[PDB]
């Protein structure tokens, strides 16, 4: 008797509220063997639950390309650009700057426990991670970065797994 429209309206509101509040609960940073920092769950997440936003600076593809080239000139700067399609254009969330936000610290796997989704709030796209399966406390959060480039895989063989 949660009709379709209502289940939809409630889910939209729930997600919007989480994005807007920026509460990043149920997660902690840890050093992960072979990966640098990573994020570990400190509570159970159920399949379909919001985990965290991939928060950063929203930019357009031409600007993103320029930045990517600039960051590449500094070996101390990591790789935090997340490209995606929205309304017939390509955008990028640039999470390169060190902030307190956790989404940018989540590592890669092809057998991860989170899935990235596009969620728009009044015309502004947001990238969010949702649990793809039940996640137990103590598990490292992981999702598929999606970079299948030969050059990327050559430089970072971990992208293949």
């Amino acid at each position: 008797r949660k009709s379709k429209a209502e289940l939809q309206s409630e889910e939209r509101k729930r997600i919007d509220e989480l994005i807007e509040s920026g509460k990043e609960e149920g997660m902690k940073i840890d050093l992960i063997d072979g990966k640098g920092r990573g994020v570990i769950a400190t509570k159970q997440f159920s399949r379909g639950d919001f985990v965290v936003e991939y928060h950063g600076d929203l930019i357009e593809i031409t600007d993103a390309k320029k930045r990517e080239a600039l960051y590449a000139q500094d070996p101390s700067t990591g790789c935090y650009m997340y490209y995606f399609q929205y309304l017939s254009k390509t955008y990028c969330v640039d999470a390169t700057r060190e902030t307190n936000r956790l989404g940018r610290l989540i590592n890669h796997s092809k057998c991860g426990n989170c899935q990235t989704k596009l969620h728009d709030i009044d015309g502004v796209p947001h990238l969010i991670l949702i649990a793809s399966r039940d996640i137990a406390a103590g598990e490292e959060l992981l999702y598929d970065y999606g970079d299948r480039s030969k050059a990327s895989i050559e430089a970072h063989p971990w992208l293949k797994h």
């Binding site: 995606f84 970065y145 970079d147 299948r148 480039s149 990327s152």
Partner: peptide
């Protein structure tokens, strides 16, 4: 160097 790319999940 790498990036991240989202693939269609409408």
């Amino acid at each position: 160097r790498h990036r991240k790319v989202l693939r269609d999940n409408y």
